[PDB]
């Protein structure tokens, strides 16, 4: 029944956003909850944020 | 009947078909979003009974 | 009643690092202005990086160019870190041409009069083949904050040029700011505070003008509190 097929291949680049599941290697799950400005980030006495 | 892959689609603007080529297939490299037409395909449905 | 400060010594180390002193400050105003300036500096400072790049043969960021060991979006990632300062132009377009078995640095870009390259050693891509040709248009414009490439194709209105590689633009020239408030002694005045802001740049913006524009923004926002 099928006469011809056209396959289009899409390169979707997906950044990270609230909802993505992330975890380290020690069974520590976690869903990113807010994406925050570099300014609100806790920084150390050197000025380097976290 | 059989289905066509023609770039002539009923009830879409000229700007809808802009990303499509002459044969009805989008160009390589064209950045697209949801809803955009990838392959213009049309199937036979006669005696519409309106 | 209230003593007001001024900027004294602005000691500069690397082109990227600097230490700015603010000397006649009252108690509590070292930290009141220090943070509220660090908050302005990091977030809302004008600067320019590359917005769009057209590559000669390439149709899109997921291609290969014979004679280059970097993938195209690795070359686009190299340009995101291109530190240009342009003078009287809001958007300028540069032209990069280089062939041979040499690494293509940021000094290999054609130099416009209004354009200044901060890192001539900066690596754009490498060339492996002998006669391996590469040529590109790199479109830099001034901007604020962080503008992704995703948000650029809403206005669009025919950006069809299938070979126009849109890149993400991180326009802030501020990389890092720290402020340390230590006591200041200015002859007689029992206790005052010396505010030291220490900051790292990408080289495009100089420290003094950054602080001036940082506090200029701050005065303008308080205009909606000088009255109601």
UniProtKB/Swiss-Prot annotation, chain B:
Uses in industry and biotechnology: Co-administration of salinamide and rifampicin or salinamide and myxopyronin suppresses the emergence of resistance to both antibiotics.
Post-translational modifications: Acetylated on several lysine residues in the presence of glucose.
Assembly description: The RNAP catalytic core consists of 2 alpha, 1 beta, 1 beta' and 1 omega subunit. When a sigma factor is associated with the core the holoenzyme is formed, which can initiate transcription. The rRNA transcription and antitermination complex (rrnTAC) consists of RNAP, NusA, NusB, NusE (rpsJ), NusG, SubB, ribosomal protein S4, DNA and precursor rRNA; S4 is more flexible than other subunits. In pull-down experiments interacts with CedA. (Microbial infection) Interacts (via flap domain) with Escherichia phage lambda antitermination protein Q; this interaction renders bacterial RNAP resistant to transcription pausing and allows it to read through termination signals.
Main function: DNA-dependent RNA polymerase (RNAP) catalyzes the transcription of DNA into RNA using the four ribonucleoside triphosphates as substrates. Resistance to the antibiotics salinamide A, salinamide B, rifampicin, streptolydigin, CBR703, myxopyronin, and lipiarmycin can result from mutations in this protein.
Recorded family membership: Belongs to the RNA polymerase beta chain family.
Protein name in UniProt: DNA-directed RNA polymerase subunit beta
Lineage: Bacteria, Pseudomonadati, Pseudomonadota, Gammaproteobacteria, Enterobacterales
Curated annotation (Swiss-Prot), chain C:
UniProt PTM: (Microbial infection) ADP-ribosylated on both alpha subunits by the phage T4 protein ModA. ADP-ribosylated on only one of the alpha subunits by the phage T4 protein Alt.
Region (Alpha N-terminal domain (alpha-NTD)): 1-228
Region described as Required for interaction with Crp at class II promoters: spans on this chain: 156-159
Catalyzed chemical reaction(s): RNA(n) + a ribonucleoside 5'-triphosphate = RNA(n+1) + diphosphate
Domain of life: Bacteria
UniProt GO cellular component terms: cytoplasm; cytosol; cytosolic DNA-directed RNA polymerase complex; membrane; transcription elongation factor complex
Mutagenesis or variant effect for residue 39 to C: In rpoA112; temperature-sensitive, blocks RNA polymerase assembly
Transmembrane segments: none
Enzyme Commission number(s) from the entry: 2.7.7.6
GO MF assignments: DNA binding; DNA-directed RNA polymerase activity; protein dimerization activity
Broad EC category: transferase
Keywords attached to this entry: Acetylation, ADP-ribosylation, DNA-directed RNA polymerase, Nucleotidyltransferase, Transcription, Transferase
Biological-process GO terms, alphabetical: bacterial-type flagellum assembly; bacterial-type flagellum-dependent cell motility; cell motility; cellular response to cell envelope stress; DNA-templated transcription initiation; intracellular iron ion homeostasis; nitrate assimilation; regulation of DNA-templated transcription elongation
Subunit structure: Homodimer. The RNAP catalytic core consists of 2 alpha, 1 beta, 1 beta' and 1 omega subunit. When a sigma factor is associated with the core the holoenzyme is formed, which can initiate transcription. Both the N- and C-terminus interact with different regions of transcriptional regulator CRP. The rRNA transcription and antitermination complex (rrnTAC) consists of RNAP, NusA, NusB, NusE (rpsJ), NusG, SubB, ribosomal protein S4, DNA and precursor rRNA; S4 is more flexible than other subunits.
Notes concerning its domains: The N-terminal domain is essential for RNAP assembly and basal transcription, whereas the C-terminal domain is involved in interaction with transcriptional regulators (such as CRP) and with upstream promoter elements.
Reported function: DNA-dependent RNA polymerase (RNAP) catalyzes the transcription of DNA into RNA using the four ribonucleoside triphosphates as substrates. This subunit plays an important role in subunit assembly since its dimerization is the first step in the sequential assembly of subunits to form the holoenzyme.
Family: Belongs to the RNA polymerase alpha chain family.
Name of this protein: DNA-directed RNA polymerase subunit alpha
Source organism: Escherichia coli (strain K12)
Entire-sequence positions represented here: 7 to 234 of 329
């Amino acid at each position: 029944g099928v006469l011809k097929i056209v396959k289009v291949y899409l390169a979707v680049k997906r950044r990270i956003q609230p909802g993505d599941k992330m975890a380290g290697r020690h069974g520590n799950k976690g869903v990113i909850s807010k994406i925050n400005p570099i300014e609100d980030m806790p920084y150390d006495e050197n000025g380097t944020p976290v | 009947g059989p289905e066509e892959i023609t770039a002539d689609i009923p009830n879409v603007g000229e700007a809808a078909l802009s990303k499509l080529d002459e044969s009805g297939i989008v160009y390589i490299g064209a950045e697209v979003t949801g809803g955009d037409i990838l392959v213009g395909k049309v199937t036979p449905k006669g005696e519409t009974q309106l | 009643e209230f003593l007001k400060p001024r900027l004294v010594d602005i000691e500069q180390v690397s082109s990227t690092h600097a230490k700015v002193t603010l000397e006649p400050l009252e108690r509590g105003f070292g930290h009141t202005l220090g943070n509220a300036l660090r908050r302005i500096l990091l977030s809302s400072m004008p600067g320019c990086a590359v917005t769009e790049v057209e590559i000669d043969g390439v149709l899109h960021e997921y291609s290969t160019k014979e004679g280059v060991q970097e993938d195209i979006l690795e070359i686009l990632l190299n340009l995101k870190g291109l530190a240009v300062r342009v003078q009287g132009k809001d958007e300028v377009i540069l032209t990069l041409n280089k062939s041979g078995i040499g690494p293509v640095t940021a000094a290999d870009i054609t130099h416009d009069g209004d354009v200044e390259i901060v890192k001539p050693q900066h690596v754009i891509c490498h060339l492996t083949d002998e006669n391996a040709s590469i040529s590109m248009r790199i479109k830099v414009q001034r901007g604020r904050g962080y503008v992704p490439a995703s948000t650029r194709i809403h206005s669009e209105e025919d950006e069809r040029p299938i070979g126009r590689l849109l890149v993400d633009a991180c326009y802030s020239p501020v990389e890092r700011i720290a402020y340390n408030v230590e006591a200041a002694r200015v002859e007689q005045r029992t206790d005052l505070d010396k505010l030291v802001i220490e900051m790292e740049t990408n080289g495009t913006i100089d420290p003094e003008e950054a602080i001036r524009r940082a506090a200029t923004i701050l005065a303008e926002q308080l205009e909606a509190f000088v009255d109601l």
